[PDB]
Amino acid sequence: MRECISIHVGQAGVQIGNACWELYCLEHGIQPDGQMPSDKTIGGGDDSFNTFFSETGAGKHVPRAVFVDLEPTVIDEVRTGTYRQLFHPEQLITGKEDAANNYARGHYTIGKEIIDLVLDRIRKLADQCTGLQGFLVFHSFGGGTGSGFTSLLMERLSVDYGKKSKLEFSIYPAPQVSTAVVEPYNSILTTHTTLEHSDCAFMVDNEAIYDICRRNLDIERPTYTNLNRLISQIVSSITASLRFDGALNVDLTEFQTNLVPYPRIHFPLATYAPVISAEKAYHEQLSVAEITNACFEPANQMVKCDPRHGKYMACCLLYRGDVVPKDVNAAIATIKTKRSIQFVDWCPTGFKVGINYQPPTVVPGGDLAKVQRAVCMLSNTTAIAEAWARLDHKFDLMYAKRAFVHWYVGEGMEEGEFSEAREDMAALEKDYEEVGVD
Amino acid sequence: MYTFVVRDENSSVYAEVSRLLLATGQWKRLRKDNPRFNLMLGERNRLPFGRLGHEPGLVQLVNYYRGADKLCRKASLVKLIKTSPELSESCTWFPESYVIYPTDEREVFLAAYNRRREGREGNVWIAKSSAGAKGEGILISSEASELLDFIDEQGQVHVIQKYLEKPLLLEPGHRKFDIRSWVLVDHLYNIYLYREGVLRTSSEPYNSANFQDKTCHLTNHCIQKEYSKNYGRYEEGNEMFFEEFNQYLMDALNTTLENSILLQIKHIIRSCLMCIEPAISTKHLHYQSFQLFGFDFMVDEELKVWLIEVNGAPACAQKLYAELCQGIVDVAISSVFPLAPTSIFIKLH
Amino acid sequence: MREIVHIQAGQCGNQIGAKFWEVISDEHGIDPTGSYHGDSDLQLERINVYYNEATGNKYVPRAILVDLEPGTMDSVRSGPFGQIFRPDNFVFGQSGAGNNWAKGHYTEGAELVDSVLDVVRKESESCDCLQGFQLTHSLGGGTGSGMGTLLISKIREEYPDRIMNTFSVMPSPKVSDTVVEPYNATLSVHQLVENTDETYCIDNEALYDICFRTLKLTTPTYGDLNHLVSATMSGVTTCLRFPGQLNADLRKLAVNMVPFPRLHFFMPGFAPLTSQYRALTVPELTQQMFDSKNMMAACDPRHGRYLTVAAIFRGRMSMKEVDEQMLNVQNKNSSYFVEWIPNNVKTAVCDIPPRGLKMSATFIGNSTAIQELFKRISEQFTAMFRRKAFLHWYTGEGMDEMEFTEAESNMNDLVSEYQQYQDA
Amino acid sequence: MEVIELNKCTSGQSFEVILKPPSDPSLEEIQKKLEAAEERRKYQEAELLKHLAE
Ligand SMILES: Nc1nc2c(ncn2[C@@H]2O[C@H](COP(=O)(O)OP(=O)(O)OP(=O)(O)O)[C@@H](O)[C@H]2O)c(=O)[nH]1
Ligand SMILES: Nc1ncnc2c1ncn2[C@@H]1O[C@H](COP(=O)(O)OP(=O)(O)CP(=O)(O)O)[C@@H](O)[C@H]1O
Ligand SMILES: Nc1nc2c(ncn2[C@@H]2O[C@H](COP(=O)(O)OP(=O)(O)O)[C@@H](O)[C@H]2O)c(=O)[nH]1
Numbered sequence A: 001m002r003e004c005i006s007i008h009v010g011q012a013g014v015q016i017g018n019a020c021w022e023l024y025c026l027e028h029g030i031q032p033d034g035q036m037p038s039d040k041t042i043g044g045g046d047d048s049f050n051t052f053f054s055e056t057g058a059g060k061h062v063p064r065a066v067f068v069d070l071e072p073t074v075i076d077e078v079r080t081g082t083y084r085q086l087f088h089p090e091q092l093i094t095g096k097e098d099a100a101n102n103y104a105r106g107h108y109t110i111g112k113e114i115i116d117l118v119l120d121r122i123r124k125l126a127d128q129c130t131g132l133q134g135f136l137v138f139h140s141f142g143g144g145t146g147s148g149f150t151s152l153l154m155e156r157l158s159v160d161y162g163k164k165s166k167l168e169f170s171i172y173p174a175p176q177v178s179t180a181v182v183e184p185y186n187s188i189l190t191t192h193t194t195l196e197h198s199d200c201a202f203m204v205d206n207e208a209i210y211d212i213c214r215r216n217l218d219i220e221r222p223t224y225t226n227l228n229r230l231i232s233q234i235v236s237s238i239t240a241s242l243r244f245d246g247a248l249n250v251d252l253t254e255f256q257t258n259l260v261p262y263p264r265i266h267f268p269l270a271t272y273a274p275v276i277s278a279e280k281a282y283h284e285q286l287s288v289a290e291i292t293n294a295c296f297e298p299a300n301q302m303v304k305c306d307p308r309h310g311k312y313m314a315c316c317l318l319y320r321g322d323v324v325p326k327d328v329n330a331a332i333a334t335i336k337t338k339r340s341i342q343f344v345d346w347c348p349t350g351f352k353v354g355i356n357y358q359p360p361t362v363v364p365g366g367d368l369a370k371v372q373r374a375v376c377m378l379s380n381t382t383a384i385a386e387a388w389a390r391l392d393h394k395f396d397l398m399y400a401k402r403a404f405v406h407w408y409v410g411e412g413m414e415e416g417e418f419s420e421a422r423e424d425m426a427a428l429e430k431d432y433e434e435v436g437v438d
Numbered sequence B: 001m002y003t004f005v006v007r008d009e010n011s012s013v014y015a016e017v018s019r020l021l022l023a024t025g026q027w028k029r030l031r032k033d034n035p036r037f038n039l040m041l042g043e044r045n046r047l048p049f050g051r052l053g054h055e056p057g058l059v060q061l062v063n064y065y066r067g068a069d070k071l072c073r074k075a076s077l078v079k080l081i082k083t084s085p086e087l088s089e090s091c092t093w094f095p096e097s098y099v100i101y102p103t104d105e106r107e108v109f110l111a112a113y114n115r116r117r118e119g120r121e122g123n124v125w126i127a128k129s130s131a132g133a134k135g136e137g138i139l140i141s142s143e144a145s146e147l148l149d150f151i152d153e154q155g156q157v158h159v160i161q162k163y164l165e166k167p168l169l170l171e172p173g174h175r176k177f178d179i180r181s182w183v184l185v186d187h188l189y190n191i192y193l194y195r196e197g198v199l200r201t202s203s204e205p206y207n208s209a210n211f212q213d214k215t216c217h218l219t220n221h222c223i224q225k226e227y228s229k230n231y232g233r234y235e236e237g238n239e240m241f242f243e244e245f246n247q248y249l250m251d252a253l254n255t256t257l258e259n260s261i262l263l264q265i266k267h268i269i270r271s272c273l274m275c276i277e278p279a280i281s282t283k284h285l286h287y288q289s290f291q292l293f294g295f296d297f298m299v300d301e302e303l304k305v306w307l308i309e310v311n312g313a314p315a316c317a318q319k320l321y322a323e324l325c326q327g328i329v330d331v332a333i334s335s336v337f338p339l340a341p342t343s344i345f346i347k348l349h
Numbered sequence C: 001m002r003e004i005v006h007i008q009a010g011q012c013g014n015q016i017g018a019k020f021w022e023v024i025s026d027e028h029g030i031d032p033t034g035s036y037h038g039d040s041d042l043q044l045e046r047i048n049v050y051y052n053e054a055t056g057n058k059y060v061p062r063a064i065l066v067d068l069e070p071g072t073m074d075s076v077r078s079g080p081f082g083q084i085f086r087p088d089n090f091v092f093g094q095s096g097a098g099n100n101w102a103k104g105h106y107t108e109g110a111e112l113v114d115s116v117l118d119v120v121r122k123e124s125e126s127c128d129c130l131q132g133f134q135l136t137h138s139l140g141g142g143t144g145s146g147m148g149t150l151l152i153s154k155i156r157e158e159y160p161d162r163i164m165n166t167f168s169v170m171p172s173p174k175v176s177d178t179v180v181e182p183y184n185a186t187l188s189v190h191q192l193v194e195n196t197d198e199t200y201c202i203d204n205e206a207l208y209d210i211c212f213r214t215l216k217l218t219t220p221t222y223g224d225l226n227h228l229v230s231a232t233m234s235g236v237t238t239c240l241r242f243p244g245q246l247n248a249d250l251r252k253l254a255v256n257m258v259p260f261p262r263l264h265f266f267m268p269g270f271a272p273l274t275s276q277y278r279a280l281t282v283p284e285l286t287q288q289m290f291d292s293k294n295m296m297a298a299c300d301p302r303h304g305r306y307l308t309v310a311a312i313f314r315g316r317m318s319m320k321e322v323d324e325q326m327l328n329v330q331n332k333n334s335s336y337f338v339e340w341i342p343n344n345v346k347t348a349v350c351d352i353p354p355r356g357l358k359m360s361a362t363f364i365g366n367s368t369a370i371q372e373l374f375k376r377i378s379e380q381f382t383a384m385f386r387r388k389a390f391l392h393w394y395t396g397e398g399m400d401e402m403e404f405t406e407a408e409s410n411m412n413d414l415v416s417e418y419q420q421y422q423d424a
Numbered sequence D: 001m002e003v004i005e006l007n008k009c010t011s012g013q014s015f016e017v018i019l020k021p022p023s024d025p026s027l028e029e030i031q032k033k034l035e036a037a038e039e040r041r042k043y044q045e046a047e048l049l050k051h052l053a054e
C-alpha cells in the first residue's frame, strides 16, 4: 500500500479541498469525528482507503493533506467547520497578508518567507509513509497565491522528492466569477515556471462549471459552493481508483502512463454526466448509452472547446453505478459511427474503462440528485489548446501597452520574465498545432 | 441595437450585407478588433473560431462554418467523397478524380488511365490546383505524361480529373457553359437554395480537337472577358439567367429547367451538406454559424448534372447582389437577431 | 490586511471626514457613544477595518483629526458623533495657513507634522495587519492641500510598503474662496501623482451643479455638497467594510484599477439622486449611475475612454438582473471602454443598503476624460502666472519661481499622458 | 473491437477496448533567483528613500 499526500493552496484550492474531503468521508463511511465503524483493524491496516487516511490508536482516520493560504480567512472556516475534528493544527498553515492577485508577490516577496515552513510540515506526513508515491496539488490560475506560491512549491518538491509524481487540479479563470483584471498574467507566469515540474494537470474552467450549474441544475446565479460541490464529484471520479479496490489507475504513475505520451502536453480534458437537479422530483434514469454519448457534448466538458477539430492521444472512461462491460462496449460501438473521433496516427484508437459498482455519493441536501450510474471521461485532445489561445490573446492585448506591469517589477520581477513566459506558451501552442492539425 | 465587426474588406457580398444592416438603424458597426460583437463577418484565412462564444451576455454568430473547408478545397473534396460511406466513392454525380502530390494516388491514377487507354475510351484529363486563381494553373491533355510533368513543376498539390468531353452546348454558338447556384446554410442547418442561378458561358465555339486554346474550354469570367474575342456577343457579360435558359430548354429540348437539371442540383447539394453535418453543426455549440456557398455544376449532353467544385467565399452576379443580400439578412441574421412575401429560397429537407 | 488608518486635514477635510463617520457608524449599528445596537451579524464581521475595540465592547474610530487652526475641529467635537472620536487623536495648532500652500507645506505645517506622525505611529503599532491610510482634504486651501501633501510624503518615508489613498476636493471658480486656489491645487497634484496609490477626485463644480439642476436646490450650501460626498464615500468603501469577494482591500483594489502608476485619479458616481419613496428598478439604477449627471468630477465621460471601472450595488435585489444590466451597459457603449484591457468592469453586491434607500449603486471610474479637470486648473494657473500675479504670498514663505514652473510642467505632462492613452 | 485485460473484483471491474491500432534546477539556483529578486526590491526602495531625503 502506497500513500498519497494532497496539498491545497489559496482560496480556490482550500475551498475545493474542503468539498472533496467531505465527499470522501461520505463515500468511505467516516463520521465527521474521524471514527469509522466499518474499519475493523483498529489503529492500523493497509487497505485501499489507507492511501488517503492514516490511523491513530484511538481509531481516528486522518486525511493525508496540507492546507496553505497566505491569509487566514478561508482556512479558519476549516478549523471551525463540520470536519474540524478531522485534521490537526500542523496540517493547516496560514500567513497574515496575501499576494493581492500578484504572481510576483506570491512567488518572490511572500513565498520566500513561508516555503521552508510548508516543506517541513509536508516532510512530517512523508515520514509517516511506508511508500509515498506523490502529491496532488489544488490551486487557481488567477490568484496571487494559487499561481505564485504554487509554482515555487513545485520547484522545491522536485528537488526534495525527485522521484515522486505530481498531479495538478487547476482552476482556469472566467470573467463571470473572477476577481481580478490581471488573471491572464498570473495564469501564464505560473504555467511557465510550473510546466516542467508537473506530470499531469486537470484544468477546470469556471465558465464551464458556471453554465452547467445554470443549465442542468437550474441555479439562477451559481455560487462557489454550487461550483465546488460539482467540482468535487468530478475530482472524486478521478481519485476513486486510488481509494478503492480496482485495477486501473491504481497509482499516480499510471495517470502519466495512460494519459500523457508527451510530457509538455499533459492537460487532459474532463467530461462528466449526468448532472441532474435534485428538486426535479420525477426524472427518468439515463442508460449507459445515454450517459456515454453525453461525454461527447461540449456542454458537459470542464473546458468549452470543440474536440471535433482536434485529435485524441488517449481516452479513459470511469463509471460508477450499475454498469457492466457489455453495455459499455455496445454504447461505444454506436458512438463511433455517429461522432468525429480522430486519434493521432501514432496512437491506438481505443479506450481504457474502469467500473466501480458503488454509485455516486451526493452530499445530503445538495443540488445534485442521486443517480443509478454516472461516468467521467478523461481525454487528451489537442482541442484544449483553444483555452491557451484565449488566454494568450488577453495577455497580448495588455502587455503591448505594459498595462499593470509595474506592479510585478515593483516586487522584484524583471520585465524579461514576462516575454520569457509568453515565448514558452507560444511554443506550447505550436506543439499542439503540430500534433493535431494537418 | 445589435453590433457587428468586419474582418474581410475584400468581400463584395458582405460589403453589401454590411450596408443593409446599417440602413436598418438597428445595427452598429464596431472597430474590427472589438470583441463585444453580436455578428462577425470574418476573415478568409485563420479565422479565430477558438475565441468565439466566450463573451458573457452576448449571443455570437459568424458567417463561416469551422471545418467546411473539407468541402471547399479541391484536394480535400476528393478525399471527402472517396472515404465517406454516405457518399460511397461511387456516387454518380462526381467525376473520377485522383489526388497527386509533386497520401498520394499516383499509382491508382495510372491504372485507370491504362484501362481507358486499352479500352479506347475518351482519355482527356484536366489537372488543377487550389492556388489556381483566375484562369492560371490548369492543363487539359489526353496524355498522362504531360499532366504529371506539369504537376512536378509546381510545388503545390494537384488533382487529376476526367475532362467532361461531351458537354451540353448552347445554340447558336456551339458553346460551353457552367451553372452557379448560391446556397445558404443557417444556424439550424436549414438548407436554402437561392431561386436565381446564373450560367457563365464561353463566347467561343467548343473545339474538341485543340485543348491548348483554353478559351472555349474554360468558362471563367476572367478568361472570357480577356482572351475571347467574342465577349458579350450573345448575352450581356457571358451570363445567361434562369428565365432565358428555361425558355430555351422548352424551345429546343421540350423540357423545363426544374425537371431536367434542378432535381439533380437539389439532390447534390443535400448529399454534400448532410454528409458533413455531424462534423460542423453548431446546434449545441457555444457560438453559431451560417455560411453562403457557391456550387459549380456541369451539364452533359444527356442532361445529367455533374458537380465541379464548391466555393466557400463566393461572389455574386452584378444584377443579383441586391435581392440575395437582403435574403441573407432576413434568413440568416434577423432570424437570430430579430428586428422591430414569398421567399426567394427553396428549403431542402 | 484588515486595519485602515484614517486621517482628515483642514476645514474641508474635517467637515467631510466627520459626515463620513456619522454615515458609516449608522450602517454598522454603532451609536454616538461607541456602543453597538445592531441586529445583524454582517454589521460586526469587518468592523475592525475602521474601528478599534475598547473595554466594555466599545468601538472607537481609527481616525486622526488635523488642522492648523482650532475652529473647525471644535465644531466636530461638538457635532452629532463628536464624542465617539479618541480625544488624543485631535492634533492642531493656532496660526492657520491663510489659504497658502507654502504655509501648510514648508513653514506652519512643518512645525506641527511631527506630532501628527506620533499619533499615526501609535495607531499603526497596535494593528494586527495594517492595510494603509486614507486621507480626506481639499486642494484649494493651505492646510489640507499643503500640510496634507507633506503628511503623505512623510508617511510614505516611514511606511513605504503600505497603500496610500485620498479623497481630494478640487476647486472651482463657481464655488470659490480665494483667487489663489489654482496655485494651491497645481502644487498639490504634483505631490499626489508621486505619493498616492488611489485618489478620488471630487470636483466642487459637479457637486454644485447636481444640487442646483438635479436636486432642485436654488441656493446650495457646503452642507448640501457634503451630503453628496458622504453618500459617495460610504459607497466606495462598502467593499472594504462588509464581507465580499471583489476589491475587498486597498491593494487588490489598486491592482484592479491602476494600470500605470501615475494614472490613479478616479471619477466617482452615485445613484439615485432625487429631490423619495418610489422603488428604483435595477435597470434604473444602472442607467443613472453611468450618466454624467451623476458624476462627481465635472468631466464628460463621452469625451474620453474608461481604463477600468468598479461598480457596487447595495440592497436586496436580483443578482441575475444586476449581471444582465451591467453587461448591457458595456455591450451597448463599447466605444467608451479601452479594448486593450479585457473585462475591465467589475461588479460587487452587498445585501445591506444605505440608510433611507431600498437599493443604491456606486460607480468608480478610471477615465481619460479626467484630463479635462487638470486642463481647467492648468488654464486658471497660467492666466495668473504669466503676469506673476499673487506670487508674493508664496515668495515671502521662501518659495522660488522655478518651483511653480516645475509644478506646471508636471501637470501638463499628466494631461499629455492621459491624451496618450485616449488615442492608443 | 477487441476487449483485453479484464480484471474483476468484489467492488468492480476494468478492461480495455481497442478499435484500431496505430499508423531540474538545483536548490542553490532557486535560492539565487529568489535572492536576486529581493536585491532588486531593496535597490528600488533605497532609491525612493534617497529621493525622499532630497
Ligand atoms: N471554482 C472555484 N473558483 C474559485 C474559488 N475561489 C476562488 N476561485 C477563483 O480563483 C481565482 C482567484 O484566485 P484565488 O484562489 O481566490 O486567489 P488566492 O490563491 O487566494 O491568492 P491571493 O491573490 O493571495 O488572494 C478567480 O478566478 C476565482 O474565480 C472557489 O472556491 N471555487
Ligand atoms: N472535369 C471537368 N470537365 C470539364 N470541364 C471542366 C472540368 N473541370 C473544370 N472544367 C472547366 O474549367 C474550369 C476550371 O475552373 P476551376 O474548376 O478551377 O474553378 P476555379 O477555382 O478556377 C474558379 P471558381 O472558384 O469560380 O470555381 C471550370 O469553370 C469549367 O468550365
Ligand atoms: N465640498 C466642500 N468643499 C469645501 C468645504 N470647505 C471648504 N471647501 C473648499 O475647500 C477649498 C480649500 O479650503 P479649505 O479646505 O477650507 O482650507 P484649509 O483649511 O487650509 O485646508 C476651497 O476650494 C473651498 O471651496 C466643504 O465643507 N465642502
Ligand SMILES: [Ca+2]
Residues within 6 Å of the ligand: A039, A040, A041, A042, A043, A044, A045, A046, A055
Ligand atoms: Ca484499519
Ligand SMILES: [Ca+2]
Residues within 6 Å of the ligand: C111
Ligand atoms: Ca511658529
Ligand SMILES: [Mg+2]
Residues within 6 Å of the ligand: A010, A011, A071, A098, A143, A145
Ligand atoms: Mg486569497
Ligand SMILES: [Mg+2]
Residues within 6 Å of the ligand: B311
Ligand atoms: Mg476556386
Ligand SMILES: [Mg+2]
Residues within 6 Å of the ligand: C011, C012, C141, C177
Ligand atoms: Mg476655508
